[PDB]
Design an enzyme around this catalytic site. Structure first.
Site, PDB file in Angstrom:
ATOM      1  N   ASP A 374     -85.830  39.038 -86.686  1.00  0.00           N
ATOM      2  CA  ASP A 374     -85.237  39.388 -85.416  1.00  0.00           C
ATOM      3  C   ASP A 374     -84.266  40.548 -85.638  1.00  0.00           C
ATOM      4  O   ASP A 374     -83.787  40.746 -86.767  1.00  0.00           O
ATOM      5  CB  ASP A 374     -84.496  38.172 -84.877  1.00  0.00           C
ATOM      6  N   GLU A 377     -84.327  46.532 -84.689  1.00  0.00           N
ATOM      7  CA  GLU A 377     -84.276  47.837 -84.036  1.00  0.00           C
ATOM      8  C   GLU A 377     -83.720  48.984 -84.917  1.00  0.00           C
ATOM      9  O   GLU A 377     -84.224  50.087 -84.800  1.00  0.00           O
ATOM     10  CB  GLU A 377     -83.553  47.783 -82.679  1.00  0.00           C
ATOM     11  N   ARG A 425     -89.708  42.101 -83.755  1.00  0.00           N
ATOM     12  CA  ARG A 425     -89.330  42.607 -82.437  1.00  0.00           C
ATOM     13  C   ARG A 425     -89.404  44.139 -82.338  1.00  0.00           C
ATOM     14  O   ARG A 425     -89.344  44.730 -81.247  1.00  0.00           O
ATOM     15  CB  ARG A 425     -87.841  42.230 -82.278  1.00  0.00           C
ATOM     16  N   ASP A 442     -85.858  39.431 -75.357  1.00  0.00           N
ATOM     17  CA  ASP A 442     -85.038  38.428 -74.691  1.00  0.00           C
ATOM     18  C   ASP A 442     -85.170  38.536 -73.162  1.00  0.00           C
ATOM     19  O   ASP A 442     -84.231  38.805 -72.428  1.00  0.00           O
ATOM     20  CB  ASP A 442     -83.584  38.521 -75.208  1.00  0.00           C
TER      21      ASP A 442
HETATM   22  C1  LIG Z   1     -83.131  37.452 -81.416  1.00  0.00           C
HETATM   23  C2  LIG Z   1     -84.447  37.077 -80.689  1.00  0.00           C
HETATM   24  O1  LIG Z   1     -84.830  38.097 -79.752  1.00  0.00           O
HETATM   25  C3  LIG Z   1     -84.424  35.717 -80.023  1.00  0.00           C
HETATM   26  O2  LIG Z   1     -85.775  35.243 -79.804  1.00  0.00           O
HETATM   27  C4  LIG Z   1     -83.662  34.774 -80.906  1.00  0.00           C
HETATM   28  O3  LIG Z   1     -83.834  33.439 -80.436  1.00  0.00           O
HETATM   29  C5  LIG Z   1     -82.173  35.141 -80.852  1.00  0.00           C
HETATM   30  C6  LIG Z   1     -81.330  34.270 -81.781  1.00  0.00           C
HETATM   31  O4  LIG Z   1     -81.728  34.411 -83.157  1.00  0.00           O
HETATM   32  C7  LIG Z   1     -81.886  36.650 -81.029  1.00  0.00           C
HETATM   33  N1  LIG Z   1     -81.287  37.279 -79.805  1.00  0.00           N
HETATM   34  C8  LIG Z   1     -79.935  36.725 -79.556  1.00  0.00           C
HETATM   35  C9  LIG Z   1     -79.271  37.156 -78.232  1.00  0.00           C
HETATM   36  C10 LIG Z   1     -77.954  36.379 -78.157  1.00  0.00           C
HETATM   37  C11 LIG Z   1     -77.117  36.623 -76.917  1.00  0.00           C
HETATM   38  C12 LIG Z   1     -76.395  35.348 -76.462  1.00  0.00           C
HETATM   39  C13 LIG Z   1     -75.580  35.624 -75.194  1.00  0.00           C
HETATM   40  C14 LIG Z   1     -75.047  34.350 -74.528  1.00  0.00           C
HETATM   41  C15 LIG Z   1     -74.963  34.515 -73.012  1.00  0.00           C
HETATM   42  N2  LIG Z   1     -74.117  35.621 -72.597  1.00  0.00           N
HETATM   43  N3  LIG Z   1     -74.345  36.251 -71.390  1.00  0.00           N
HETATM   44  N4  LIG Z   1     -74.525  36.790 -70.376  1.00  0.00           N
END
Ligand SMILES: *[C@H]1[C@H](O)[C@@H](O)[C@H](O)[C@@H](CO)[C@@H]1NCCCCCCCCN=[N+]=N
EC number: 2.4.1.161
Length: 779
Positions: A374, A377, A425, A442
């Protein structure tokens, strides 16, 4: 002002000198050319090309005003004064430089009416002409129905003139597709390699075949990649992980793989990244856990990231090993991330690669079956960070690509008899040659987020990534489940490349944690996914052979109708299924722009013929609209819980007969599901079916090729169901032996041939052994 001065031909490459410097032209195949400006200077190498140093034999001819440099199908025409190169397939102009090359800048003409797909992940409309956007991989957390810039950009386009153009540059840059100037395509970068690659083809399939030939073909994933994944962000403990595997068993959902997010290495989201080792307070017996899951046919995948935090257990060691990118002063570079304060592992260095690779090897030895990378980028990448081969801005868009290469090479060295599973990603053109399976990041838990996924999938599929997929059900935010959206998303999931529901754990992502109604809907569809493995795995095989994506756009159905390019709502899943996902709440019917021909309702068997006009189908909550093409052979095996138990001893094949399709072909690729050398070494069983349909006869020719594989069944019990079968067939010959066709009680007798008059289905049940088999139905 740029003009030709001279040229030489050396090692099959044309080196041209202008007043401004040298340009090197090398054919990477008969249909693809690499054009390198500033050829005399030292610069980063190609990332896009699989064989960057090849240069096949071409012909050069010269005239007063031009040079022509020509491979088998593609020709470069070099105008001497002013200097400009243009590209031809046959006698047809594909693309011309305007001012061409001039910090780094390429300018080309666009033709009137030319439609331009490309740029990788963007939510802008399928035709990106009229848009300008950056070439800089970057997170777009919580995106819905719009994005000019997200996780995995590609510096490449596909034109309605059937060429693909790649800007083979890894740096922070931009693409202007006739936005600023309506007839100009402009490519820009701050630094990096000043080269482009043009690939031509005679059809969209051939173009993609030619593109993947020079950029790389994806090796066949392990068959388990096509199964059901349990995932969330994130299982908080071994007990919780075990309870989830157990829930799949007790709820009777198929499960191949469980995915562990960042809690496997620490109890908080922040502060632990880089530990790259088990948090033993919450995962106390992880070797037993993985072994116990393996006994149930369930694989374990772990998340990893590029960053090592100064708070992590591996900071001091990473520094000592020189594994981290540095500042200009020469110290490890540290910087603020969402996750805390830290550095980035320099995958472009020997030291960084050996250090990171060793950690992967160790965890893989412990029982980890596949890998999730993950934030590649890289999500945060300050400008003055220095890698072994250049600064952050120069290497940015290749970081993920090199990370995949490192991990791929490592996994092949450790397990040469297994196919690596690498889910990331962010990458570059060519990353598919390292097995990269990308997902669209995400995405918000909104209908808009779902409604964007076909666009994103097709855009990535067209430019090399057959296994592009989404977090099924949506990932980001939300306060309570949107049940209808979730069901629609997991329905669509069945007909897209990887079946991986995933989301933030305040709302369950896994289908086993849903209400009774939702499970009653999705359970038979997740089983359908497994029953359909021979269809899906055969499309996967074709992707490995030819680059042919698993999802294909509507526009493949008629290459002379460029208006179809805009469609991002109906797509082909393999050759035979036209799928139209439902992407808003409460939709009572859809208009499906089926190509001219005969089509059947996948779920209800209804026959439709159309000469062009769209078909209107009602919707229901238990399905999404899927049409089967007349002439399709749809192959099924019985549902299993895990692909570890996959057998094709029993085959059930559905043929969709119509007199409008006088010749049809199908194939089923079978191997052991795991050997990375099965295709190269012919260790497979390729089953072929041919239907010949005339006024008075329907004839099926069945055969098998290849050398087989260990455990291949010699004889398969086969049930062939012929839909829309004539009620006039009176006898069947099986290899010349005549058998009567029963006309009653087909479901209630062990009938070898039986016609069901109410369903218009003719069922034949027989033994398919190693020898050729002919079945002739006669009026
Ligand atoms: C990378 C990946 O794209 C995801 O599939 C993974 O599950 C996570 C964790 O490893 C990672 N992206 C993490 C993004 C975290 C942001 C959390 C914010 C909380 C809410 N705030 N607001 N608004």
């Amino acid at each position: 002002a740029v003009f030709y001065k001279e040229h030489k031909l050396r090692n099959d490459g044309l080196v041209i000198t202008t007043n401004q410097g040298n340009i090197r032209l090398q054919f990477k195949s008969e249909a693809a050319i690499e054009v390198l400006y500033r050829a005399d200077s030292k610069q980063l190498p190609s990332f896009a090309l699989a064989q960057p140093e090849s240069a096949i034999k071409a012909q050069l001819t010269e005239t007063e005003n031009h040079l022509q440099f020509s491979g088998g199908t593609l020709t470069a025409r070099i105008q001497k004064r002013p200097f400009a190169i243009s590209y031809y397939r046959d006698s047809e102009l594909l693309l011309a430089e305007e001012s061409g090359f001039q910090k780094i800048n390429f300018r080309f003409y666009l033709s009137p009416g030319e439609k331009i797909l490309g740029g990788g992940q963007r939510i802008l409309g399928m035709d990106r002409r009229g848009q300008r956007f950056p070439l800089y991989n970057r997170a777009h957390y919580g995106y819905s129905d719009h994005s000019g810039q997200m996780y995995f950009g590609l510096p490449a386009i596909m034109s309605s003139k059937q060429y693909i153009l790649v800007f083979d540059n890894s740096a922070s840059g931009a693409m202007d597709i006739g936005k600023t100037e309506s007839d100009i395509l402009q490519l820009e970068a701050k630094s990096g390699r000043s080269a482009y690659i043009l690939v031509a083809g005679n059809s969209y399939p051939s173009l993609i075949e030619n593109f993947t030939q020079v950029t790389g073909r994806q090796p066949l994933p392990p068959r388990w990649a096509l199964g059901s994944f349990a995932s969330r962000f994130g299982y908080r403990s071994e007990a919780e992980t075990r309870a989830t595997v157990q829930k799949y068993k007790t709820e009777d959902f198929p499960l191949d793989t469980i995915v562990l997010d960042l809690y496997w290495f620490g109890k908080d989201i922040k502060g632990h990244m880089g530990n790259l080792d088990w948090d033993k307070e919450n995962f106390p017996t992880p070797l037993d856990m993985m072994a116990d899951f393996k006994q149930q046919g369930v694989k374990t995948v772990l998340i990893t990231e590029p960053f090592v935090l100064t708070s992590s257990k591996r900071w001091d060691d990473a520094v000592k090993a020189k594994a981290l990118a540095k500042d200009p002063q020469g110290q490890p570079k540290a910087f603020e991330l969402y996750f805390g304060n830290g550095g980035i592992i320099d995958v472009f260095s020997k030291e960084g690669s050996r250090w990171f690779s060793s950690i992967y090897k160790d965890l893989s030895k412990q029982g980890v079956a596949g890998w999730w990378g993950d934030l590649g980028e890289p999500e945060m990448h300050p400008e003055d960070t220095q890698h072994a081969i250049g600064d952050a801005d120069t290497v940015h868009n290749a970081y993920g690509h090199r990370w995949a290469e490192m991990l791929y090479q490592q996994q092949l060295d450790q397990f040469p008899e297994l196919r690596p599973f690498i889910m990331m990603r962010a990458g570059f053109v060519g990353s598919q040659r390292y097995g990269m399976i990308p997902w669209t990041g995400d995405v918000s838990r909104t209908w808009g987020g779902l409604a964007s996924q076909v666009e994103l999938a097709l855009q990535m599929s067209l430019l090399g990534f057959g296994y592009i997929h989404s977090d099924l059900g949506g990932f980001a935010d939300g306060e309570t489940l949107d049940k209808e959206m979730y069901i629609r998303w997991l329905q669509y999931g069945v007909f897209q490349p990887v079946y991986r529901p995933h989301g933030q754990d305040h709302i369950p992502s896994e289908p086993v944690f849903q209400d009774e109604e939702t499970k009653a809907i999705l359970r038979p569809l997740v089983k359908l996914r497994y029953r359909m493995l021979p269809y899906i795995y055969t499309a996967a095989y074709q992707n490995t052979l030819t680059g042919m994506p698993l999802m294909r756009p509507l526009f493949f159905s008629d290459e002379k109708n460029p208006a179809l390019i805009d469609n991002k709502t109906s797509y082909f899943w393999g050759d035979s299924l036209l799928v139209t996902p439902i992407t808003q709440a409460g939709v009572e019917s859809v208009s499906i722009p089926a190509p001219k021909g005969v089509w059947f309702d996948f779920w209800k068997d209804t026959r439709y013929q159309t000469d062009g006009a769209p078909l209107t189908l009602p919707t229901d909550l238990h399905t999404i609209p899927v049409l089967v093409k007349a002439g399709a052979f749809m192959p099924y095996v019985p549902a299993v819980s895990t692909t570890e138990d996959y057998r094709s001893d029993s085959l059930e094949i559905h043929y969709y007969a119509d007199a409008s399709v006088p010749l049809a072909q199908g194939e089923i690729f079978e191997d052991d599901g795991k050997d990375p050398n099965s295709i190269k070494r012919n260790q497979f069983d390729l089953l072929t079916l041919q239907a010949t349909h005339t006024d008075n006869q329907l004839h099926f020719q069945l055969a098998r090729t290849g050398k087989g594989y260990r455990g291949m069944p010699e004889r398969r019990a086969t049930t062939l169901v012929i839909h829309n079968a004539s009620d006039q067939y009176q006898h069947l010959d099986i290899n010349g032996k005549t058998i009567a066709i029963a006309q009653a009680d087909c479901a209630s007798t062990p009938a070898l041939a039986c016609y069901d008059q109410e369903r218009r289905q003719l069922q034949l049940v027989f033994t398919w052994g190693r020898e050729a088999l002919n079945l002739r139905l006669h009026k």
